[PDB]
Design a protein around this nucleic acid. Structure first.
Ligand SMILES: [Zn+2]
Ligand SMILES: [Zn+2]
Length: 637
RNA sequence: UUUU
């Protein structure tokens, strides 16, 4: 490394554009950003940063700070006690106190004055928030881990920084991308980006549809290049497109075996959401009497290593790679990953899963980038006939099936992952509720409610409409008194036994595990009940099996004896709520993406589909395309 | 409050 050698030049230009009265105590690197500590308060920053080509954060010296047990009631006083301040956390690792007030306007300073007045008394960065409608165990837990681990996090960030700046901006000699999983297949997405100077992992999923076979369930750990990057400790960073297990599922496995301790970049909502899905994942395994892939301490490590980034925020993550995340419109926090390699040498955009039309919760994926030579895109519906049903026709079909089900005295089972389709279908029923249509109750089972809480904590990540409809008003469609969160194992049993028709939405989305499987098993026989698939059912899942028509499904239970569930209930498939761009959308994304890429690489789709989309794009746009296999490596330059 |  030669970082402090570089800081020696940074410090020579910083202490050259700011009054010595600022008594600059220290200037170090914290993750991507540069930290300039000073022992005194107070347009300059904007200039300092535009010159240094970095993200600078200037805070008071960590010495002029007050303990969280003394600076708590010291602030609670210097604030108009009207704005109900539900909570008030502490972040000493970055000097910044969080004021989770119910009324932010009366706590920040009616005239932007109670902003600096308050900070003084304790010398902590005053940041106001609006007590979200729902409380999240997950968010609270993360906050707990971050504040009670300030020591490590500080150590970790300083290291990452010395790493990211082990040398000045570099122009790479070559660039290659290798598929470790998720190429010509759905699941276990994992793409390794290489240059002669760096290595970054884009996603690292698992395929729950096949944990039975680790060679089909995990990314290729058996790739020479990947083993070489892990063992030598050369992985600069891991980036996650979105929270689903098939993109971040194996991430904690990495810590369980001490294979990595570098930074993980992702949007805040994805950090919170993935942590949720991971705990949910190991617990479902255990409830099944199976040894879990990892444990809470491992997930605790993920948290401790994650460096969040909001959309549009450009950050240097290595000497020759610059990251920027953009909206993918797939699920809360979903991002298209953009890599600016070299200083104008080459640019890659990895799509992850994306939707290119509006939905209740999100806006179509970003299709504009400053530069874009190579585009890696998903192909879940890459087939030529993979046109999803129009959103409104689906919506109407969903209400239809429910009526023809409630009428004949039955229940409607809607399997869906805690994150994604669940909230989308919720909205559909919630708007339909406000106009008199939701008679029977709607039960949410499987951490779907916990996930819904996280949504309400991130209004800025939802569509502008749903966003304003959140904080600006005292309204919230998620709070709707029409959803009844299934509290425990018992309540679940009651619901099943009861005779009151009802709508049941529960994870997992593919009947691969969790609350959804119990309902399935118990409702299958009765033809009064109905099951509606509103998500892609992957090959190898009990879901696709049921969705395919199989009427007698063998299932292995305890003490090794198999069970044969008799499927009589009605089987319906409504794909119009999909979080995936359909065939038309994918093609249309290519047409609109700008700048037009030199080459497109189709991935994340059944083999035929990746092939089909790739062949189709080339034929219609004349763009160089390819549908690589895992372990294929494409030299981009 | 960095860039091609
Ligand atoms: Zn997904
Ligand atoms: Zn996926």
């Amino acid at each position: 490394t030669q970082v402090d050698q570089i800081l020696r030049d940074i410090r020579a230009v910083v202490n050259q554009m700011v009054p010595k009265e600022a008594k600059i105590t220290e200037i170090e690197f914290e993750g991507p950003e540069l930290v300039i500590y000073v022992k005194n308060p107070e347009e300059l920053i904007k200039d300092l940063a535009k010159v240094l080509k970095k993200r600078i954060s200037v805070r008071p010296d960590p010495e002029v700070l007050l303990p969280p047990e003394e600076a708590e009631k010291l602030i609670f006083e210097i604030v108009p006690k009207e704005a109900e301040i539900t909570n008030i956390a502490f972040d000493p690792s970055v000097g910044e106190v969080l004021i989770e007030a119910k009324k932010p306007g009366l706590v920040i300073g009616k005239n932007g004055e109670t902003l600096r007045l308050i900070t003084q008394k304790v010398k902590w960065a005053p940041k106001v928030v609006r007590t979200p409608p729902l409380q999240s165990q997950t968010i609270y837990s993360i906050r707990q881990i971050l504040q009670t681990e300030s020591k490590d996090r500080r150590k970790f960030l300083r290291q990452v920084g010395r790493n990211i700046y082990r040398k000045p901006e570099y122009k790479s000699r070559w660039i290659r991308i290798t598929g470790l999983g998720g190429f010509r297949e759905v699941g276990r997405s994992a793409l390794l980006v290489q240059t002669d100077e760096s290595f970054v992992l884009v996603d690292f999923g698992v395929n729950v549809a096949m944990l039975n076979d680790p060679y089909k369930a995990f990314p290729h750990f058996d790739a020479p290049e990947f083993q070489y990057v892990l063992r030598e400790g050369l992985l600069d960073a891991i980036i996650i497109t979105h929270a689903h297990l098939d993109h971040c599922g194996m991430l904690p496995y990495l810590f369980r075996y001490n294979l990595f301790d570098g930074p993980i970049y992702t949007t805040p909502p994805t950090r919170d959401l993935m942590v949720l899905l991971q705990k949910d994942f190991i617990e479902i395994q255990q409830s099944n009497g199976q040894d879990p892939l990892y444990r809470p301490r491992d997930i605790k490590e993920v948290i401790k290593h994650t460096i969040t980034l909001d959309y549009g925020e450009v950050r240097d993550i290595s000497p020759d790679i610059r990251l920027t995340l953009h909206n993918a419109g797939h699920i809360l926090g979903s991002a298209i990953v953009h890599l600016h390699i070299g200083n104008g040498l080459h640019n890659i955009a990895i799509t992850g899963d994306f939707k290119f039309i509006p939905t209740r919760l999100l806006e179509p994926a970003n299709a504009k980038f400053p530069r874009l030579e190579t585009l890696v895109m998903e192909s879940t519906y890459g087939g030529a006939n993979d046109i999803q049903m129009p959103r409104e026709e689906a919506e109407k079909r969903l209400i239809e099936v429910i009526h023809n089900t409630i009428k004949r005295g039955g229940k409607v089972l809607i399997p869906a992952m805690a994150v994604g389709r669940a909230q989308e279908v919720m909205m559909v029923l919630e708007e339909y509720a406000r106009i008199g249509g939701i008679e029977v109750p709607i039960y949410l089972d499987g951490m779907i409610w916990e996930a819904t809480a996280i949504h309400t904590a991130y209004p800025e990540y939802l569509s502008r409409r749903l966003r304003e409809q959140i904080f600006k008003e005292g309204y919230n469609p998620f709070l709707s008194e029409i959803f009844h969160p299934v509290a425990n194992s018992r309540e679940r049993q009651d619901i099943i036994d009861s005779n009151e028709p009802a709508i049941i939405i529960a994870s997992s989305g593919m009947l691969v595990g969790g609350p959804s499987v119990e309902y399935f098993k118990q409702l299958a026989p009765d033809p009064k009940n109905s099951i509606i698939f509103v998500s892609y059912q992957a090959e190898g899942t009990l879901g696709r099996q049921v969705q395919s028509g199989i009427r007698e499904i063998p299932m292995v239970g305890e003490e090794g004896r198999t069970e044969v569930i008799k499927v009589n209930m009605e089987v319906h498939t409504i794909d119009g709520f999909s979080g995936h761009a359909d065939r038309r959308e994918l093609m249309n994304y290519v047409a609109k993406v700008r700048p037009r890429p030199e080459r497109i690489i189709t991935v994340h789709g059944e083999p035929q589909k990746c092939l089909d989309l790739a062949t189709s794009i080339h034929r219609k746009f004349g763009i160089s395309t390819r549908a690589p296999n895992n372990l294929d490596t494409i030299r981009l330059r």
